[PDB]
């Protein structure tokens, strides 16, 4: 299943009746460790799938149907039907409790993988493991302006730090990363300045649209591995849902008040334009 | 001299024979007379005659060299007029003759042979009589000084086969030499070499005429790989990529120029104005073309479909009086006017568009002539809105007596013909149907279809929305095509059934809402109701029926204007339609 989506009279004559399993499983080196299988169709094709167990997957189907009604509105109008704004929804099937199956894509990479192996031998090593690593410099500065050596120092941070001190210490690590790392990623592979720009425009429109619709139903916890960049046509899509409505800033101990992620890299890709013409126009549209 | 220009071959052989014989005694004051009938034979057959023509120039270059002798203007002008044709003799339809001429050019002390002063002299003999092969000829000259080797001569043989690999090979080779020249030739000499290089490249872009896309892209690519060549020419790079269909190499060149400065952004606006991408267009005039408090208050009503208030705050922005807070600099006085024109054109401004287009260059009255042709800033931007506003005003029915005579005096000459027939031709075909030279209009719509092929060929594979903007017009082209192919058929007017068929295939076949803007909508709507009035003129209840299909067309136009948020255009359309919707009852409700 994954068919029977409503929307017309259903017909099982051309549905994929199962006919075969692969002689291969592939593991994902992660915490939960999902596995991955390569099932076969009687209609002479293949369908790959990911298996995650031990997790109640009865909310992600709901938010995907929300995404479907969302980008059903987004192509109902005119001014966004010009520029063809669409969310890429996909299918997770809820087998039972603590068992469901993830629909899987092809040759996609995680955003942190792209930003890691885009870098050379030097800056990737300096970002991962450095004595002045922007993780390690950040935890050392946390021990600076608090005094403790564990969690709760972050709760102490706002009573032992003013604004501009933190602003300058934030520049002291913002300087520790090259600016156009994302453009170094796009120049690593595009091999034509004819194609480079229709790649970059697609990346920008994708990230702007998912950031303006990750706020109406506000979702925090957007860290690095909730962005699957697809190198095949220059698109990023988002996975691994944590918190549905505005809930990631209430019940969490160290809350977060950014509506999405727009950090240094989405700024410096758009150089030498300020972030005022493209992302602004997409969001306001 | 008269018998030399006659029509027989052996006479023309022996006259070149005796001219070669009488050579080193003739005086140079009459050689400038003599040499001009000589080089009229490059459009002639028979390799004997052309062989002797290139036999005599091989010495007229070799001993009238004038080694800084300072003798005349003719004696060191024949050198130029001989170097011209001894360059152009590299593209003849006879191999072996090219072996002769390239054995001359490859000979000792004809082009120096250290390694790279070779290439520096190779920039000199460009001569835009030829440009199509210069990369292939240049890499042949470069790899001539070569003498694990079985690949290099088939590489040079495949080099002269497609423009793409030749472009790649020149862009590889030149950048390789310029990267690895740093074993000598120090920084002052480095700066001097790049000075001469930038001078030669400016010379290239200012010389070339029939623009060749791999060559234009080759120079604009190799400019962006060394630390000097960036500030090339922000005034002619853009004008090359306006009509070479080669935008997104020049865009990348201008971005690398702006990184590490006002005319740059103005030409960048003109560059992005043609390939869509209106978001980065509007995100420029809030950054540099601005720093006032009317630019933002017009752009925030231009980002949505509010195209009346941003117009009404542009005439206030330009005919202001005091403004002692900071004056409009060299960046925005042009743009306020130009965006006023465009936001006029976005709605139905077909009365007050001629005024703001041509009433900024001259006196009170329209003197319209070469004034709008000369200074081609007045010809590239003010002119297309002028001719568009003109005929989109004429087509509804007036006399107005200017455009007829204007194109009548226009279509005479070289550069008043090779633009007005090169570019547009559709509205010209339409006003020729008005002027009833439909066979001239048939030739013009033929060249228009051919022009659409010519444009749509070299537009690239993935540069989307450019293809769509180029693609939408073909419904209008086949609409005027089916009008012509209808009216030449005789059996229409003595019956009713092909008129009913044309009405039914018009009311059936449509453009759609929410995917076609009101400019192309306005094109097809005014074009088709104009044809309805035209065939009403030709057949001299179908008045009520033609009113019915007219009202359905404009009502569909109304609903499309509602759907794409243009409340002002539909507002003025219904207000023009208000007494028009007094005629019926169902049309009223």
UniProtKB/Swiss-Prot annotation, chain A:
Residues 21-285 form the PI3K/PI4K catalytic domain. The modification Phosphoserine is found at residues 30, 120. Autophosphorylated at two clusters, the T2609 cluster and the S2056 cluster. Autophosphorylation induces a conformational change that leads to remodeling of the DNA-PK complex, requisite for efficient end processing and DNA repair. It is found in: Nucleus; Nucleus, Nucleolus; Cytoplasm, Cytosol. Residues 218-226 are annotated as: Catalytic loop. Residues 238-263 are annotated as: Activation loop. Residues 27-33 are annotated as: G-loop. It comes from the Eukaryota. Belongs to the PI3/PI4-kinase family. DNA-PK is a heterotrimer of PRKDC and the Ku dimer (composed of XRCC6/Ku70 and XRCC5/Ku86). Formation of this complex may be promoted by interaction with ILF3. Component of the core long-range non-homologous end joining (NHEJ) complex (also named DNA-PK complex) composed of PRKDC, LIG4, XRCC4, XRCC6/Ku70, XRCC5/Ku86 and NHEJ1/XLF. Additional component of the NHEJ complex includes PAXX. Following autophosphorylation, PRKDC dissociates from DNA. Interacts with DNA-PKcs-interacting protein (KIP) with the region upstream the kinase domain. It is linked to Immunodeficiency 26 with or without neurologic abnormalities: A form of severe combined immunodeficiency characterized by reduced or absent T and B cells, recurrent candidiasis, and lower respiratory tract infections. Some patients show dysmorphic features, severe growth failure, microcephaly, seizures, and impaired neurological functions. Serine/threonine-protein kinase that acts as a molecular sensor for DNA damage. Involved in DNA non-homologous end joining (NHEJ) required for double-strand break (DSB) repair and V(D)J recombination. Must be bound to DNA to express its catalytic properties. Promotes processing of hairpin DNA structures in V(D)J recombination by activation of the hairpin endonuclease artemis (DCLRE1C). Recruited by XRCC5 and XRCC6 to DNA ends and is required to (1) protect and align broken ends of DNA, thereby preventing their degradation, (2) and sequester the DSB for repair by NHEJ. This is DNA-dependent protein kinase catalytic subunit. It comes from Homo sapiens (Human). The lineage of its organism: Eukaryota, Metazoa, Chordata, Craniata, Vertebrata.
Swiss-Prot record, chain B:
The modification Phosphoserine is found at residue 150. TPR repeats lie at residues 262-290, 291-324. The modification N6-acetyllysine is found at residues 556, 575. Autophosphorylated at two clusters, the T2609 cluster and the S2056 cluster. Autophosphorylation induces a conformational change that leads to remodeling of the DNA-PK complex, requisite for efficient end processing and DNA repair. S-nitrosylated by GAPDH. Residues 16-540 are annotated as: KIP-binding. The modification Phosphothreonine is found at residue 115. It is found in: Nucleus; Nucleus, Nucleolus; Cytoplasm, Cytosol. It is linked to Immunodeficiency 26 with or without neurologic abnormalities: A form of severe combined immunodeficiency characterized by reduced or absent T and B cells, recurrent candidiasis, and lower respiratory tract infections. Some patients show dysmorphic features, severe growth failure, microcephaly, seizures, and impaired neurological functions. Belongs to the PI3/PI4-kinase family. Serine/threonine-protein kinase that acts as a molecular sensor for DNA damage. Involved in DNA non-homologous end joining (NHEJ) required for double-strand break (DSB) repair and V(D)J recombination. Must be bound to DNA to express its catalytic properties. Promotes processing of hairpin DNA structures in V(D)J recombination by activation of the hairpin endonuclease artemis (DCLRE1C). Recruited by XRCC5 and XRCC6 to DNA ends and is required to (1) protect and align broken ends of DNA, thereby preventing their degradation, (2) and sequester the DSB for repair by NHEJ. DNA-PK is a heterotrimer of PRKDC and the Ku dimer (composed of XRCC6/Ku70 and XRCC5/Ku86). Formation of this complex may be promoted by interaction with ILF3. Component of the core long-range non-homologous end joining (NHEJ) complex (also named DNA-PK complex) composed of PRKDC, LIG4, XRCC4, XRCC6/Ku70, XRCC5/Ku86 and NHEJ1/XLF. Additional component of the NHEJ complex includes PAXX. Following autophosphorylation, PRKDC dissociates from DNA. Interacts with DNA-PKcs-interacting protein (KIP) with the region upstream the kinase domain. This is DNA-dependent protein kinase catalytic subunit. It comes from Homo sapiens. The chain holds residues 2421 to 3274 of 4128 of the full protein.
């Amino acid at each position: 299943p994954g068919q029977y989506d409503g929307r017309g009279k259903p017909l099982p004559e051309y549905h994929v009746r199962i006919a075969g399993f692969d002689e291969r499983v592939t593991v994902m080196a992660s915490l939960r460790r999902p596995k991955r299988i390569i099932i076969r169709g009687h209609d002479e094709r293949e369908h790959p799938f990911l298996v995650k167990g031990g997790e109640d997957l009865r909310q992600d189907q709901r938010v995907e149907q929300l995404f479907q009604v969302m980008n059903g509105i987004l192509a109902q109008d005119s001014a966004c039907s010009q520029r063809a704004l669409q969310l890429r929804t996909y299918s997770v099937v809820p087998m039972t409790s603590r068992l469901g199956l993830i629909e899987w894509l092809e040759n996609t990479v995680t955003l942190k993988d792209l930003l890691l192996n885009t870098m050379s031998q030097e800056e990737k090593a300096a970002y991962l493991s450095d004595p002045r690593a922007p993780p390690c410099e950040y935890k050392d500065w946390l021990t600076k302006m608090s005094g403790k050596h564990d969690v709760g120092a972050y709760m102490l941070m706002y009573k032992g730090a003013n604004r501009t001190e933190t602003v300058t210490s934030f520049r002291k690590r913002e300087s520790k990363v090259p600016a156009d790392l994302l453009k170094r990623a796009f120049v690593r592979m595009s091999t034509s300045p004819e194609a480079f720009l229709a790649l970059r425009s697609h990346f920008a429109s994708s990230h702007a649209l998912i950031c303006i619709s990750h706020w109406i139903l506000g979702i925090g916890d957007r860290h690095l591995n909730n962005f699957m960049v697809a190198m095949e046509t220059g698109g990023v899509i988002g996975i691994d849902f944590g918190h549905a409505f505005g809930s990631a800033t209430q019940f969490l101990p160290v809350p977060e008040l950014m509506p999405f992620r727009l950090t240094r890299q989405f700024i410096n890709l758009m150089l030498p334009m300020k972030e005022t013409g493209l992302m602004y126009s997409i969001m306001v549209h | 001299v008269q018998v030399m220009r006659h029509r027989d071959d052996e006479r023309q052989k022996v006259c070149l024979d005796i001219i070669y014989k009488m050579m080193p005694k003739l005086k140079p004051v009459e050689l400038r007379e003599l040499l001009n009938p000589v080089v009229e034979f490059v459009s002639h057959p028979s390799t004997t005659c052309r062989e002797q023509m290139y036999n005599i120039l091989m010495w007229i270059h070799d001993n009238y060299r004038d080694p800084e002798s300072e003798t005349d203007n003719d004696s060191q002008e024949i050198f130029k007029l001989a170097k011209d044709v001894l360059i152009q003799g590299l593209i003849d339809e006879n191999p072996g003759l090219q072996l002769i001429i390239r054995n001359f050019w490859s000979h000792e002390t004809r082009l120096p042979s250290n390694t790279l002063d070779r290439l520096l002299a190779l920039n000199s003999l460009y001569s835009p009589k030829i440009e199509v092969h210069f990369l292939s000829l240049a890499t042949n000259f470069l790899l001539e000084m070569t003498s694990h080797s079985s690949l290099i001569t088939p590489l040079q043989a495949v080099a002269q086969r497609d423009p793409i690999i030749a472009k790649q090979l020149f862009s590889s080779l030149f950048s390789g030499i310029l990267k690895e020249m740093d074993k000598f030739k120090t920084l002052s000499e480095k700066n001097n070499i790049t000075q001469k290089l930038l001078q030669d490249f400016n010379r290239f872009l200012n010389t070339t005429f029939s623009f060749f896309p791999p060559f234009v892209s080759c120079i604009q690519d190799i400019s962006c790989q060394h630390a000097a060549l960036l500030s090339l020419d922000p005034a002619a790079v853009s004008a090359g990529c306006l009509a070479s269909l080669q935008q997104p190499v020049g865009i990348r060149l201008l971005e690398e120029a702006l990184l590490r400065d006002v005319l740059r952004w103005v030409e960048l606006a003109k560059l992005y104005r043609s390939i869509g991408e209106y978001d980065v267009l509007r995100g420029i005039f809030t950054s540099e073309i601005g720093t006032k408090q009317i630019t933002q208050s017009a752009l925030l009503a231009e980002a949505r479909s509010d195209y009346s208030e941003a117009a009404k705050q542009y005439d206030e922005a330009l005919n202001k009086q005091d403004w002692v807070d900071g004056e409009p600099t060299e960046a925005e006085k042009d743009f306020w006017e130009l965006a006023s024109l465009d936001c006029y054109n976005h709605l139905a401004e077909w009365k007050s568009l001629e005024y703001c287009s041509t009433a900024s260059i001259d006196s009170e009255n329209p003197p319209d002539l070469n004034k709008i042709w000369s200074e081609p800033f007045y010809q590239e931007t003010y002119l297309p809105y002028m001719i568009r506003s003109k005929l989109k005003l004429l087509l509804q029915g007036e006399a107005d007596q200017s455009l007829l005579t204007f194109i009548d005096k226009a279509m005479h000459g070289e550069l008043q013909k090779a633009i007005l027939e090169l570019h547009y031709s559709q509205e010209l075909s339409l006003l020729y149907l008005l002027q009833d030279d439909v066979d001239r209009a048939k030739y013009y719509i033929q060249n228009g279809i051919q022009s659409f092929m010519q444009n749509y060929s070299s537009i690239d594979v993935l540069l989307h929305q450019s293809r769509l903007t180029k693609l939408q017009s073909v419904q209008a082209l086949t609409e005027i095509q089916e009008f012509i192919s209808f009216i030449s058929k005789q059996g229409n007017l003595s019956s009713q059934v092909p008129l009913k068929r044309l009405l039914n295939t018009w009311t059936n076949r449509y453009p759609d809402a929410k995917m076609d803007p009101m400019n192309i909508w306005d094109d097809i709507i005014t074009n088709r109701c104009f044809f309805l009035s035209k065939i009403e003129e030709k057949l001299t209840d179908i008045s009520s029926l033609i009113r019915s299909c007219k009202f359905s067309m404009k009502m569909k136009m109304i609903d499309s204007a509602r759907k794409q948020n243009n409340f002002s255009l539909a507002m003025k359309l219904l207000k023009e339609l208000h007494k028009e919707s007094k005629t019926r009852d169902d049309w009223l409700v």
